[PDB]
Design a protein around this ligand. Structure first.
Ligand SMILES: [Cl-]
Ligand SMILES: [Cl-]
Ligand code: NA
Ligand SMILES: [Rh+]
Length: 129
């Protein structure tokens, strides 16, 4: 599914990301735009053999099992395929574990490089929430 900006903002708010670990909703919408272009089916193969999956490009080296990332963990205890669903539940619940682990949203390189310290409020302008 390719979400609209306000559509994803509303779903992320429903699934409890607004101010989760102190990150306003706009941080999560900005991260999803630059990670996945709001496409739940986005995948990126890394040169290390891991793959990034879904709306928040969650990586198979640590967080999900894809059966093809040798030596990897599965800390969200999910198949990576669950992170590509139209239903953002699995992505959001894993994203909550990632952002809670110590480096906060810096775990998302696109958030660090493109969203962090910017006017992230802009991403929820015009949305019903
Ligand atoms: Cl893909
Ligand atoms: Cl694996
Ligand atoms: Na893995
Ligand atoms: Rh939902």
């Amino acid at each position: 599914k390719v979400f609209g900006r306000c559509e994803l903002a509303a779903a992320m708010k429903r699934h409890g990301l607004d101010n989760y670990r102190g990150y306003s909703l706009g941080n999560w919408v900005c991260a999803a735009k630059f990670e996945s272009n709001f496409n739940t089916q986005a995948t990126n193969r890394n040169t290390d053999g891991s793959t990034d999956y879904g709306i928040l490009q969650i990586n198979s080296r640590w967080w999900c099992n894809d059966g093809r990332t040798p030596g990897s963990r599965n800390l969200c205890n999910i198949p990576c395929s669950a992170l590509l669903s139209s239903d953002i539940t699995a992505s959001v619940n894993c994203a909550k574990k990632i952002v809670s682990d110590g480096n906060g949203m810096n775990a998302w390189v696109a958030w660090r490089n493109r969203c962090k310290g910017t006017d992230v409020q802009a991403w929820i302008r015009g949305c019903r929430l």
